[PDB]
Write a protein that binds this ligand. Structure first.
Ligand SMILES: *[C@@H](CC(=O)OCC)[C@H](C[C@@H]1CCNC1=O)NC(=O)[C@@H](CC(=O)[C@@H](NC(=O)c1cc(C)on1)C(C)C)Cc1ccc(F)cc1
Length: 180
């Protein structure tokens, strides 16, 4: 089945467990030594990538035009390994996406693929009191430990999981123009 194989491939080549003072998160390698984590992962001067202490050269928290956070932080890692370029899989615009999946690595016994169903561009939400913009919503009972999880569909890297309430799950949207 090509979409599930695409999912495991994306974890093999583009996923990693980013560890910070806040705990372990699924990091998504986007291109060269750039990786994204939830902004609430709160990455310091050094983070652990798959257990290896790594220095982060620069840390860029992503915000929309009106100053609201996107809950995406772009990390530029000090390390030899280069990530495969998945940018061509990233959407240029906001949209809705039926039958999506979530690729989990951190806090999981092993790389796990969860089907969260239909996804909708849901607008701004309040995560633990904090306004957050460009939210993809889905009706799936996502749990603690899922943050950083890569929302995807065959040939499509849609977003990274950042929150939920036992009922629904929310992902920070990935847009191509952010990785330019
Ligand atoms: C993922 C965090 C993680 O894995 O960290 C590893 C150390 C986690 C996923 C949720 C836990 C419960 N269900 C989940 O899917 N994210 C968080 O815990 C963030 C906080 C929340 O998600 C809160 N939820 C809401 O605020 C909320 C709002 C709506 C419309 O639906 N749910 C609950 C835990 C109360 C952590 C976080 C993220 C972003 C922030 F700006 C602040 C805090």
């Amino acid at each position: 089945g090509p979409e599930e194989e695409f999912g495991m491939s994306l974890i093999k080549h583009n996923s990693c467990v980013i560890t910070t003072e806040n705990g372990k998160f699924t990091g998504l390698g986007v291109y060269d030594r750039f990786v994204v984590v939830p902004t609430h992962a709160d990455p310091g001067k050094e983070i652990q990538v798959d257990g290896i202490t790594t220095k982060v050269i620069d840390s860029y928290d992503l915000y929309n035009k009106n100053g609201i956070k996107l809950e995406i932080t772009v990390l530029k890692l000090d390390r030899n390994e280069k990530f495969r370029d998945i940018r061509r899989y990233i959407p240029n615009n906001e949209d809705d996406y039926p039958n999506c999946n979530l690729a989990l690595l951190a806090n999981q016994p092993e790389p796990t693929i969860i089907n969260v169903g239909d996804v909708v561009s849901y607008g701004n939400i309040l995560l633990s009191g904090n306004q957050t913009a460009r939210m993809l919503k889905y009706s799936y009972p996502t749990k603690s430990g899922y943050c950083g999880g890569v929302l995807y569909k065959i040939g499509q890297v849609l977003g990274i999981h950042v929150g939920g309430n036992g009922r629904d799950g929310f992902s920070a949207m990935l847009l191509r123009s952010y990785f330019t």
